[PDB]
Amino acid sequence: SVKISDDISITQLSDKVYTYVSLAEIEGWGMVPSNGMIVINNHQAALLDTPINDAQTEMLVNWVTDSLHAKVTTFIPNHWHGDCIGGLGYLQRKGVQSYANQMTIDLAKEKGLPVPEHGFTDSLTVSLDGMPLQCYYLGGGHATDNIVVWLPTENILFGGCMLKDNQATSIGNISDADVTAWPKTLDKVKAKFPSARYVVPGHGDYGGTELIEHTKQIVNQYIESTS
Ligand SMILES: CO[C@@H]1O[C@@H](C)Cc2oc3cc(O)c(O)c(C(=O)O)c3c(=O)c21
Ligand code: NA
Ligand SMILES: [Zn+2]
Ligand SMILES: [Zn+2]
């Protein structure tokens, strides 16, 4: 897992898909690592999630063009939080097409954060010059608006923060969470992607379909331990 900046790390999953980790500070959670994917095809790139701010995003945007040689033309945020659209204003200054759950659009609009330009309400298949990018909203989880991005041709699933990493014992940040739904939503994820080769969570190490089960448990536990 190479470093490309003092705060930005990259790992390669396939010839077309990459995952990055950007280290940032958050009042109340300290030094914390946020993930996002980068998908390439015929010199064009789609960016899923952006570091929490415009600076880290820009660095990341140039590394892509400089190292992978690709114009970043597409953006899809997991949900309305800082570690998903934190640098969208930058992307906008540079004419990037934005796509998102319609509820993510409404939430950013009323809190005066940059707004993506096209919402979907159930699913959106976005084409990066040929290669499909399937976005689905299967119910609330970590956040009411959270989606997952599926890659039919790489069997790679970007789960976002509704999925926790294998070493996580804590449910963590449930301030906008929809705990009532979270458990029904995870089942829908496992049922829809039995064959996923790679699964990337919003924070932490990636892996296989077992992060879905690991998370279903951390949550069920929380529903009981507090009930
Ligand atoms: C629990 O997992 C992670 O490990 C601990 C040590 C620190 C941490 O901080 C977070 C802070 C957030 O702003 C946030 O939105 C989440 C969140 O996704 O819930 C996380 C998160 O993931 C984790
Ligand atoms: Na990110
Ligand atoms: Zn979040
Ligand atoms: Zn998160």
PDB file of C-alpha atoms and ligand atoms in Angstrom:
ATOM      1  CA  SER A   1       0.000   0.000   0.000  1.00  0.00           C
ATOM      2  CA  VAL A   2       2.001   2.884  -1.430  1.00  0.00           C
ATOM      3  CA  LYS A   3       1.997   6.466  -0.077  1.00  0.00           C
ATOM      4  CA  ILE A   4       1.540   9.319  -2.576  1.00  0.00           C
ATOM      5  CA  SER A   5       1.451  12.187  -0.131  1.00  0.00           C
ATOM      6  CA  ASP A   6       2.017  12.596   3.619  1.00  0.00           C
ATOM      7  CA  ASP A   7      -1.702  12.052   4.154  1.00  0.00           C
ATOM      8  CA  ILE A   8      -2.687   9.944   1.166  1.00  0.00           C
ATOM      9  CA  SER A   9      -2.202   6.178   0.615  1.00  0.00           C
ATOM     10  CA  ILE A  10      -3.105   4.005  -2.382  1.00  0.00           C
ATOM     11  CA  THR A  11      -3.618   0.272  -2.905  1.00  0.00           C
ATOM     12  CA  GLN A  12      -4.428  -1.510  -6.128  1.00  0.00           C
ATOM     13  CA  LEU A  13      -7.198  -4.071  -6.386  1.00  0.00           C
ATOM     14  CA  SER A  14      -7.269  -4.565 -10.160  1.00  0.00           C
ATOM     15  CA  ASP A  15      -5.885  -2.912 -13.310  1.00  0.00           C
ATOM     16  CA  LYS A  16      -8.935  -0.588 -13.379  1.00  0.00           C
ATOM     17  CA  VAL A  17      -9.917  -0.166  -9.723  1.00  0.00           C
ATOM     18  CA  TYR A  18      -7.933   1.394  -6.880  1.00  0.00           C
ATOM     19  CA  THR A  19      -8.678   2.236  -3.241  1.00  0.00           C
ATOM     20  CA  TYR A  20      -7.125   5.141  -1.309  1.00  0.00           C
ATOM     21  CA  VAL A  21      -6.876   6.149   2.330  1.00  0.00           C
ATOM     22  CA  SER A  22      -6.686   9.781   3.285  1.00  0.00           C
ATOM     23  CA  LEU A  23      -5.732  10.651   6.844  1.00  0.00           C
ATOM     24  CA  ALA A  24      -7.704  13.513   8.405  1.00  0.00           C
ATOM     25  CA  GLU A  25      -8.601  15.029  11.780  1.00  0.00           C
ATOM     26  CA  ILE A  26     -12.164  15.271  13.081  1.00  0.00           C
ATOM     27  CA  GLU A  27     -13.193  17.191  16.194  1.00  0.00           C
ATOM     28  CA  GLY A  28     -14.315  14.360  18.446  1.00  0.00           C
ATOM     29  CA  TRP A  29     -12.767  11.364  16.691  1.00  0.00           C
ATOM     30  CA  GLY A  30      -9.123  12.367  16.240  1.00  0.00           C
ATOM     31  CA  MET A  31      -6.654  11.263  13.558  1.00  0.00           C
ATOM     32  CA  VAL A  32      -8.870   9.078  11.371  1.00  0.00           C
ATOM     33  CA  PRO A  33      -8.483   7.289   7.925  1.00  0.00           C
ATOM     34  CA  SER A  34     -11.273   7.585   5.312  1.00  0.00           C
ATOM     35  CA  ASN A  35     -11.544   5.449   2.157  1.00  0.00           C
ATOM     36  CA  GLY A  36     -12.692   6.026  -1.417  1.00  0.00           C
ATOM     37  CA  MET A  37     -12.249   4.256  -4.699  1.00  0.00           C
ATOM     38  CA  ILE A  38     -10.885   5.428  -8.022  1.00  0.00           C
ATOM     39  CA  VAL A  39     -12.080   3.636 -11.174  1.00  0.00           C
ATOM     40  CA  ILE A  40     -10.392   4.075 -14.569  1.00  0.00           C
ATOM     41  CA  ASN A  41     -11.321   3.293 -18.217  1.00  0.00           C
ATOM     42  CA  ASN A  42     -10.045   4.742 -21.539  1.00  0.00           C
ATOM     43  CA  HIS A  43      -8.239   7.545 -19.642  1.00  0.00           C
ATOM     44  CA  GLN A  44     -11.289   8.666 -17.642  1.00  0.00           C
ATOM     45  CA  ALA A  45     -11.752   8.380 -13.964  1.00  0.00           C
ATOM     46  CA  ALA A  46     -14.663   8.112 -11.599  1.00  0.00           C
ATOM     47  CA  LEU A  47     -14.036   9.069  -7.988  1.00  0.00           C
ATOM     48  CA  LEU A  48     -16.244   7.568  -5.208  1.00  0.00           C
ATOM     49  CA  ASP A  49     -16.061   9.719  -2.062  1.00  0.00           C
ATOM     50  CA  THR A  50     -13.502  12.515  -1.679  1.00  0.00           C
ATOM     51  CA  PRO A  51     -11.136  13.237   1.218  1.00  0.00           C
ATOM     52  CA  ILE A  52     -12.752  15.594   3.784  1.00  0.00           C
ATOM     53  CA  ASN A  53     -11.549  18.732   2.046  1.00  0.00           C
ATOM     54  CA  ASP A  54     -10.588  20.446  -1.227  1.00  0.00           C
ATOM     55  CA  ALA A  55      -6.770  20.304  -0.653  1.00  0.00           C
ATOM     56  CA  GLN A  56      -6.508  16.490  -0.208  1.00  0.00           C
ATOM     57  CA  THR A  57      -8.979  16.106  -3.104  1.00  0.00           C
ATOM     58  CA  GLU A  58      -6.862  18.216  -5.474  1.00  0.00           C
ATOM     59  CA  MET A  59      -3.667  16.350  -4.613  1.00  0.00           C
ATOM     60  CA  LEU A  60      -5.565  13.136  -5.182  1.00  0.00           C
ATOM     61  CA  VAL A  61      -6.990  14.501  -8.416  1.00  0.00           C
ATOM     62  CA  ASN A  62      -3.522  15.265  -9.855  1.00  0.00           C
ATOM     63  CA  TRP A  63      -1.922  11.991  -8.698  1.00  0.00           C
ATOM     64  CA  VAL A  64      -4.607  10.240 -10.802  1.00  0.00           C
ATOM     65  CA  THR A  65      -3.909  12.243 -13.933  1.00  0.00           C
ATOM     66  CA  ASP A  66      -0.147  12.215 -13.335  1.00  0.00           C
ATOM     67  CA  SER A  67       0.168   8.563 -12.380  1.00  0.00           C
ATOM     68  CA  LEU A  68      -2.814   6.841 -13.915  1.00  0.00           C
ATOM     69  CA  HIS A  69      -3.051   9.443 -16.707  1.00  0.00           C
ATOM     70  CA  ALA A  70      -6.760  10.030 -16.364  1.00  0.00           C
ATOM     71  CA  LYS A  71      -9.231  12.914 -16.450  1.00  0.00           C
ATOM     72  CA  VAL A  72     -11.526  12.632 -13.427  1.00  0.00           C
ATOM     73  CA  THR A  73     -14.956  13.129 -15.045  1.00  0.00           C
ATOM     74  CA  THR A  74     -17.222  11.399 -12.475  1.00  0.00           C
ATOM     75  CA  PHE A  75     -18.147  11.625  -8.775  1.00  0.00           C
ATOM     76  CA  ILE A  76     -20.580   9.686  -6.568  1.00  0.00           C
ATOM     77  CA  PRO A  77     -20.614  10.273  -2.789  1.00  0.00           C
ATOM     78  CA  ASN A  78     -21.671   7.470  -0.342  1.00  0.00           C
ATOM     79  CA  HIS A  79     -23.740   9.899   1.712  1.00  0.00           C
ATOM     80  CA  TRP A  80     -23.877  13.551   2.878  1.00  0.00           C
ATOM     81  CA  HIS A  81     -20.981  13.455   5.358  1.00  0.00           C
ATOM     82  CA  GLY A  82     -17.650  15.264   5.282  1.00  0.00           C
ATOM     83  CA  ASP A  83     -15.682  12.167   4.406  1.00  0.00           C
ATOM     84  CA  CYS A  84     -17.800  11.622   1.272  1.00  0.00           C
ATOM     85  CA  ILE A  85     -18.323  15.099  -0.352  1.00  0.00           C
ATOM     86  CA  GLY A  86     -15.874  17.185   1.612  1.00  0.00           C
ATOM     87  CA  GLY A  87     -14.075  18.248  -1.576  1.00  0.00           C
ATOM     88  CA  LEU A  88     -16.925  18.406  -4.045  1.00  0.00           C
ATOM     89  CA  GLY A  89     -16.707  22.183  -4.349  1.00  0.00           C
ATOM     90  CA  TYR A  90     -13.245  21.684  -5.767  1.00  0.00           C
ATOM     91  CA  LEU A  91     -14.473  19.036  -8.209  1.00  0.00           C
ATOM     92  CA  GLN A  92     -17.192  21.453  -9.275  1.00  0.00           C
ATOM     93  CA  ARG A  93     -14.762  24.321  -9.950  1.00  0.00           C
ATOM     94  CA  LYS A  94     -13.349  21.781 -12.390  1.00  0.00           C
ATOM     95  CA  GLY A  95     -16.558  20.715 -14.130  1.00  0.00           C
ATOM     96  CA  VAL A  96     -17.017  17.179 -12.714  1.00  0.00           C
ATOM     97  CA  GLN A  97     -20.383  15.437 -13.208  1.00  0.00           C
ATOM     98  CA  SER A  98     -21.865  14.507  -9.780  1.00  0.00           C
ATOM     99  CA  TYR A  99     -24.405  11.718  -9.116  1.00  0.00           C
ATOM    100  CA  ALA A 100     -26.064  10.714  -5.849  1.00  0.00           C
ATOM    101  CA  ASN A 101     -29.004   9.385  -3.913  1.00  0.00           C
ATOM    102  CA  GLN A 102     -31.701  12.095  -4.257  1.00  0.00           C
ATOM    103  CA  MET A 103     -31.865  12.245  -0.434  1.00  0.00           C
ATOM    104  CA  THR A 104     -28.104  13.070  -0.389  1.00  0.00           C
ATOM    105  CA  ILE A 105     -28.954  16.016  -2.692  1.00  0.00           C
ATOM    106  CA  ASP A 106     -31.703  17.284  -0.410  1.00  0.00           C
ATOM    107  CA  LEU A 107     -29.559  17.002   2.723  1.00  0.00           C
ATOM    108  CA  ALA A 108     -26.626  18.991   1.221  1.00  0.00           C
ATOM    109  CA  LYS A 109     -28.945  21.656  -0.151  1.00  0.00           C
ATOM    110  CA  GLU A 110     -30.491  22.454   3.178  1.00  0.00           C
ATOM    111  CA  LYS A 111     -27.155  22.526   5.025  1.00  0.00           C
ATOM    112  CA  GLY A 112     -25.440  24.689   2.396  1.00  0.00           C
ATOM    113  CA  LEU A 113     -22.812  22.167   1.314  1.00  0.00           C
ATOM    114  CA  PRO A 114     -22.066  21.792  -2.357  1.00  0.00           C
ATOM    115  CA  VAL A 115     -24.885  19.841  -4.044  1.00  0.00           C
ATOM    116  CA  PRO A 116     -24.447  17.003  -6.621  1.00  0.00           C
ATOM    117  CA  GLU A 117     -26.256  17.487  -9.938  1.00  0.00           C
ATOM    118  CA  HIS A 118     -28.275  14.288 -10.479  1.00  0.00           C
ATOM    119  CA  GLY A 119     -30.137  12.252  -7.901  1.00  0.00           C
ATOM    120  CA  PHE A 120     -31.571   8.745  -8.231  1.00  0.00           C
ATOM    121  CA  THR A 121     -34.042   7.300  -5.812  1.00  0.00           C
ATOM    122  CA  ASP A 122     -33.552   3.540  -6.212  1.00  0.00           C
ATOM    123  CA  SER A 123     -30.693   2.710  -8.598  1.00  0.00           C
ATOM    124  CA  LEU A 124     -28.388   4.450 -11.122  1.00  0.00           C
ATOM    125  CA  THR A 125     -26.144   2.745 -13.693  1.00  0.00           C
ATOM    126  CA  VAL A 126     -23.433   5.242 -14.575  1.00  0.00           C
ATOM    127  CA  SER A 127     -21.200   4.644 -17.551  1.00  0.00           C
ATOM    128  CA  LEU A 128     -17.554   5.581 -17.397  1.00  0.00           C
ATOM    129  CA  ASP A 129     -16.935   5.460 -21.120  1.00  0.00           C
ATOM    130  CA  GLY A 130     -18.339   1.927 -21.407  1.00  0.00           C
ATOM    131  CA  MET A 131     -17.689   0.255 -18.014  1.00  0.00           C
ATOM    132  CA  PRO A 132     -20.902   0.176 -15.865  1.00  0.00           C
ATOM    133  CA  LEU A 133     -21.086   1.635 -12.291  1.00  0.00           C
ATOM    134  CA  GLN A 134     -24.131   0.430 -10.386  1.00  0.00           C
ATOM    135  CA  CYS A 135     -25.377   2.586  -7.493  1.00  0.00           C
ATOM    136  CA  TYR A 136     -28.163   1.235  -5.238  1.00  0.00           C
ATOM    137  CA  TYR A 137     -30.095   2.550  -2.261  1.00  0.00           C
ATOM    138  CA  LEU A 138     -31.245  -0.561  -0.276  1.00  0.00           C
ATOM    139  CA  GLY A 139     -32.368   1.230   2.881  1.00  0.00           C
ATOM    140  CA  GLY A 140     -30.836   3.364   5.601  1.00  0.00           C
ATOM    141  CA  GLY A 141     -27.834   2.239   7.598  1.00  0.00           C
ATOM    142  CA  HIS A 142     -24.961   4.369   8.935  1.00  0.00           C
ATOM    143  CA  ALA A 143     -26.819   7.350   7.547  1.00  0.00           C
ATOM    144  CA  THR A 144     -30.371   7.638   6.154  1.00  0.00           C
ATOM    145  CA  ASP A 145     -29.121   8.359   2.622  1.00  0.00           C
ATOM    146  CA  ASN A 146     -26.312   5.813   2.238  1.00  0.00           C
ATOM    147  CA  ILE A 147     -25.845   3.788  -0.972  1.00  0.00           C
ATOM    148  CA  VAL A 148     -23.357   1.121  -2.220  1.00  0.00           C
ATOM    149  CA  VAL A 149     -21.505   1.141  -5.552  1.00  0.00           C
ATOM    150  CA  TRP A 150     -21.292  -2.224  -7.361  1.00  0.00           C
ATOM    151  CA  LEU A 151     -18.861  -3.071 -10.109  1.00  0.00           C
ATOM    152  CA  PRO A 152     -20.409  -5.910 -12.245  1.00  0.00           C
ATOM    153  CA  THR A 153     -17.180  -6.462 -14.158  1.00  0.00           C
ATOM    154  CA  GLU A 154     -14.781  -6.545 -11.187  1.00  0.00           C
ATOM    155  CA  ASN A 155     -17.132  -8.087  -8.607  1.00  0.00           C
ATOM    156  CA  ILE A 156     -16.022  -5.227  -6.435  1.00  0.00           C
ATOM    157  CA  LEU A 157     -18.307  -3.639  -3.896  1.00  0.00           C
ATOM    158  CA  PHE A 158     -17.730  -0.234  -2.290  1.00  0.00           C
ATOM    159  CA  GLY A 159     -19.830  -0.441   0.815  1.00  0.00           C
ATOM    160  CA  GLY A 160     -19.097   2.817   2.544  1.00  0.00           C
ATOM    161  CA  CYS A 161     -19.629   3.360   6.248  1.00  0.00           C
ATOM    162  CA  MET A 162     -22.635   1.082   6.503  1.00  0.00           C
ATOM    163  CA  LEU A 163     -19.967  -1.604   6.522  1.00  0.00           C
ATOM    164  CA  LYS A 164     -17.401  -1.889   9.357  1.00  0.00           C
ATOM    165  CA  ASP A 165     -13.879  -3.469   9.041  1.00  0.00           C
ATOM    166  CA  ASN A 166     -12.951  -6.858  10.521  1.00  0.00           C
ATOM    167  CA  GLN A 167     -11.030  -5.412  13.465  1.00  0.00           C
ATOM    168  CA  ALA A 168     -13.799  -3.072  14.570  1.00  0.00           C
ATOM    169  CA  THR A 169     -15.520  -3.827  17.871  1.00  0.00           C
ATOM    170  CA  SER A 170     -17.271  -0.417  18.117  1.00  0.00           C
ATOM    171  CA  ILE A 171     -20.379   0.740  16.295  1.00  0.00           C
ATOM    172  CA  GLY A 172     -18.874   4.192  16.398  1.00  0.00           C
ATOM    173  CA  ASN A 173     -20.501   7.350  15.021  1.00  0.00           C
ATOM    174  CA  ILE A 174     -24.313   6.800  15.092  1.00  0.00           C
ATOM    175  CA  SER A 175     -25.441  10.468  15.103  1.00  0.00           C
ATOM    176  CA  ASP A 176     -27.313  10.297  11.758  1.00  0.00           C
ATOM    177  CA  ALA A 177     -27.584   6.522  11.783  1.00  0.00           C
ATOM    178  CA  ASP A 178     -30.854   4.693  11.157  1.00  0.00           C
ATOM    179  CA  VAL A 179     -30.353   1.830  13.561  1.00  0.00           C
ATOM    180  CA  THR A 180     -33.892   0.520  13.042  1.00  0.00           C
ATOM    181  CA  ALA A 181     -33.159  -0.212   9.389  1.00  0.00           C
ATOM    182  CA  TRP A 182     -29.464  -0.928   9.503  1.00  0.00           C
ATOM    183  CA  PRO A 183     -29.932  -4.684  10.100  1.00  0.00           C
ATOM    184  CA  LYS A 184     -32.514  -5.156   7.278  1.00  0.00           C
ATOM    185  CA  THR A 185     -30.330  -3.188   4.885  1.00  0.00           C
ATOM    186  CA  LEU A 186     -27.211  -5.411   5.501  1.00  0.00           C
ATOM    187  CA  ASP A 187     -29.191  -8.567   4.628  1.00  0.00           C
ATOM    188  CA  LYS A 188     -30.193  -6.956   1.333  1.00  0.00           C
ATOM    189  CA  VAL A 189     -26.538  -6.319   0.633  1.00  0.00           C
ATOM    190  CA  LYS A 190     -25.468  -9.956   1.266  1.00  0.00           C
ATOM    191  CA  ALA A 191     -28.349 -11.304  -0.750  1.00  0.00           C
ATOM    192  CA  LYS A 192     -27.529  -9.058  -3.716  1.00  0.00           C
ATOM    193  CA  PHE A 193     -23.784  -9.638  -3.871  1.00  0.00           C
ATOM    194  CA  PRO A 194     -22.979 -13.214  -2.908  1.00  0.00           C
ATOM    195  CA  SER A 195     -20.107 -13.328  -5.370  1.00  0.00           C
ATOM    196  CA  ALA A 196     -18.215 -10.167  -4.327  1.00  0.00           C
ATOM    197  CA  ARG A 197     -14.471 -10.697  -4.644  1.00  0.00           C
ATOM    198  CA  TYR A 198     -13.518  -7.464  -2.827  1.00  0.00           C
ATOM    199  CA  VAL A 199     -15.452  -5.391  -0.337  1.00  0.00           C
ATOM    200  CA  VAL A 200     -14.289  -1.984   0.756  1.00  0.00           C
ATOM    201  CA  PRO A 201     -15.730  -0.279   3.937  1.00  0.00           C
ATOM    202  CA  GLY A 202     -15.789   3.447   4.710  1.00  0.00           C
ATOM    203  CA  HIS A 203     -12.972   3.055   7.295  1.00  0.00           C
ATOM    204  CA  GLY A 204     -10.439   0.315   7.712  1.00  0.00           C
ATOM    205  CA  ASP A 205      -9.098  -2.682   5.870  1.00  0.00           C
ATOM    206  CA  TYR A 206     -11.017  -4.174   2.963  1.00  0.00           C
ATOM    207  CA  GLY A 207     -11.896  -7.807   2.427  1.00  0.00           C
ATOM    208  CA  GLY A 208     -14.601 -10.262   1.384  1.00  0.00           C
ATOM    209  CA  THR A 209     -18.316 -10.855   2.048  1.00  0.00           C
ATOM    210  CA  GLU A 210     -17.546 -11.516   5.727  1.00  0.00           C
ATOM    211  CA  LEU A 211     -17.523  -7.787   6.647  1.00  0.00           C
ATOM    212  CA  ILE A 212     -21.249  -7.885   6.002  1.00  0.00           C
ATOM    213  CA  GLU A 213     -21.756 -10.516   8.709  1.00  0.00           C
ATOM    214  CA  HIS A 214     -19.231  -8.942  11.053  1.00  0.00           C
ATOM    215  CA  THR A 215     -21.197  -5.699  10.830  1.00  0.00           C
ATOM    216  CA  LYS A 216     -24.611  -7.298  11.162  1.00  0.00           C
ATOM    217  CA  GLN A 217     -23.342  -8.481  14.561  1.00  0.00           C
ATOM    218  CA  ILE A 218     -21.716  -5.284  15.893  1.00  0.00           C
ATOM    219  CA  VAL A 219     -25.086  -3.661  15.231  1.00  0.00           C
ATOM    220  CA  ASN A 220     -27.457  -6.327  16.525  1.00  0.00           C
ATOM    221  CA  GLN A 221     -25.273  -6.274  19.625  1.00  0.00           C
ATOM    222  CA  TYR A 222     -25.732  -2.532  19.958  1.00  0.00           C
ATOM    223  CA  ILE A 223     -29.537  -2.844  19.565  1.00  0.00           C
ATOM    224  CA  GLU A 224     -29.601  -5.292  22.454  1.00  0.00           C
ATOM    225  CA  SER A 225     -26.870  -3.767  24.718  1.00  0.00           C
ATOM    226  CA  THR A 226     -28.860  -0.551  24.890  1.00  0.00           C
ATOM    227  CA  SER A 227     -32.494  -1.615  24.440  1.00  0.00           C
TER     228      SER A 227
HETATM  229  C1  LIG B   1     -15.512   2.593  14.245  1.00  0.00           C
HETATM  230  O1  LIG B   1     -14.632   2.704  13.140  1.00  0.00           O
HETATM  231  C2  LIG B   1     -13.588   3.676  13.126  1.00  0.00           C
HETATM  232  O2  LIG B   1     -12.649   3.462  14.194  1.00  0.00           O
HETATM  233  C3  LIG B   1     -12.581   4.358  15.311  1.00  0.00           C
HETATM  234  C4  LIG B   1     -11.374   3.955  16.178  1.00  0.00           C
HETATM  235  C5  LIG B   1     -12.526   5.827  14.841  1.00  0.00           C
HETATM  236  C6  LIG B   1     -13.589   6.095  13.803  1.00  0.00           C
HETATM  237  O3  LIG B   1     -14.005   7.411  13.723  1.00  0.00           O
HETATM  238  C7  LIG B   1     -15.072   7.796  12.936  1.00  0.00           C
HETATM  239  C8  LIG B   1     -15.448   9.137  12.896  1.00  0.00           C
HETATM  240  C9  LIG B   1     -16.375   9.542  11.935  1.00  0.00           C
HETATM  241  O4  LIG B   1     -16.480  10.862  11.525  1.00  0.00           O
HETATM  242  C10 LIG B   1     -17.229   8.610  11.340  1.00  0.00           C
HETATM  243  O5  LIG B   1     -18.267   9.128  10.568  1.00  0.00           O
HETATM  244  C11 LIG B   1     -16.996   7.229  11.559  1.00  0.00           C
HETATM  245  C12 LIG B   1     -18.012   6.227  11.169  1.00  0.00           C
HETATM  246  O6  LIG B   1     -17.910   5.768   9.907  1.00  0.00           O
HETATM  247  O7  LIG B   1     -18.854   5.814  11.946  1.00  0.00           O
HETATM  248  C13 LIG B   1     -15.775   6.847  12.171  1.00  0.00           C
HETATM  249  C14 LIG B   1     -15.193   5.499  12.044  1.00  0.00           C
HETATM  250  O8  LIG B   1     -15.538   4.692  11.204  1.00  0.00           O
HETATM  251  C15 LIG B   1     -14.101   5.117  13.015  1.00  0.00           C
HETATM  252 NA    NA B   2     -13.125   9.524   1.447  1.00  0.00          NA
HETATM  253 ZN    ZN B   3     -20.664   9.113   7.515  1.00  0.00          ZN
HETATM  254 ZN    ZN B   4     -17.938   7.098   7.633  1.00  0.00          ZN
END
